[PDB]
């Protein structure tokens, strides 16, 4: 699984 | 923001 | 903030 | 199993 | 800032 | 600040 | 897993 | 088992 973001 | 996630 | 968790 | 956060 | 995770 | 851990 | 970020 | 994080 994975995740990705921005703040 | 931006949010992607998957599992 | 973000979260992913499995189990 | 995992845990991935941001805080 | 930038995230990206994954396992 | 992030965190990713797994067992 | 691996896990990258900025901050 | 494996731990990686930011602070």
Known sequence: G???GSA
């Open 2 to 4: 994975y995740l990705l």
